[PDB]
């Protein structure tokens, strides 16, 4: 993880957006940057408030993880790959 890295985000309107993050940034500030960036993309009106959504990804141990603790830092997540899927946990 170099200082700033490209993170592929998978929005719940189907859109993929590539986002540069500080490796140190918490998930909550990344969710914030992300939903700002989403307005530059199609189907941005189908998005509820950013707080309704939670990130999901895959760890280096091959488990699918839902990150309810958004104070956690991007570098401590142990991501197999730099991507984050955005879900309404429902």
């Amino acid at each position: 993880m170099p200082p700033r890295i490209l993170v592929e985000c998978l929005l719940p309107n189907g859109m993929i957006v590539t986002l540069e993050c500080l490796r140190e940034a918490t998930l909550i500030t990344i969710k914030h940057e992300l939903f700002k960036e989403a307005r530059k993309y199609p189907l941005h009106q189908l998005l509820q408030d950013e707080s309704s959504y939670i990130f999901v990804s895959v760890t280096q141990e091959a488990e699918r993880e839902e990150f309810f603790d958004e104070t956690r830092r991007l570098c401590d997540l142990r991501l197999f790959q730099p991507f984050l899927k955005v879900i309404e946990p429902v």
């Binding site: 993929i16 199609p42 790959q81």
Partner: protein
């Protein structure tokens, strides 16, 4: 064992030369076995890392595939509404974003295939390390025990420790 025995010195020197020959021989195989064991271990760990990473690719691919099901079902709606209002720019943008997602899925599937093929080649190296090791082990063990049979016999005839060190020395 300890105290000096009542037997011919000629017999002791011959057996001592044999201790020496068999210790050298054993030592050579053991050194050989250990070099392989080191590569065997590092290979075993790398293999275990690759299996896990394949699993994480499998799971990563599931997620991107689900993302694909999300986009056909969210853009079904809005594409049919859009070409009625003649917005082929926004349909274009949705399709461009979709191409990007499918392109990235195929890069990931490609990466998994690669790792599968490398796991295949490395698993074969591993099997060959094991066969070489198996070929040595019985030999290593048998030389060692013949070396032991001779050592103990000499120890038992009260042979001085500095003499046994001379013979074990190489």
């Amino acid at each position: 064992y300890q105290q000096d025995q009542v037997v011919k010195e000629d017999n002791i020197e011959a057996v001592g030369k044999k201790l020496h020959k068999y210790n050298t021989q054993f030592q050579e195989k053991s050194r050989e076995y250990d070099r392989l064991y080191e590569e065997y271990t590092r290979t075993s760990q790398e293999i275990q890392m690759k299996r896990t990473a394949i699993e994480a690719f499998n799971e990563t691919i599931k997620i991107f595939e689900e993302q694909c099901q999300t986009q056909e079902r969210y853009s079904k709606e809005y594409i049919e509404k859009f070409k009625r209002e003649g917005n082929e720019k926004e349909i274009q943008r949705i399709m461009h974003n979709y191409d990007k997602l499918k392109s990235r899925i195929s890069e990931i599937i490609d990466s998994r295939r690669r790792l599968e093929e490398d796991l295949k080649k490395q698993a074969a190296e591993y099997r060959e390390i094991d066969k070489r090791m198996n070929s040595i082990k019985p030999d290593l063990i048998q030389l060692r025990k013949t070396r032991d049979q001779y050592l103990m016999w000499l120890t038992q005839k009260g042979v001085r420790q500095k003499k046994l060190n001379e013979w074990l020395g190489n």
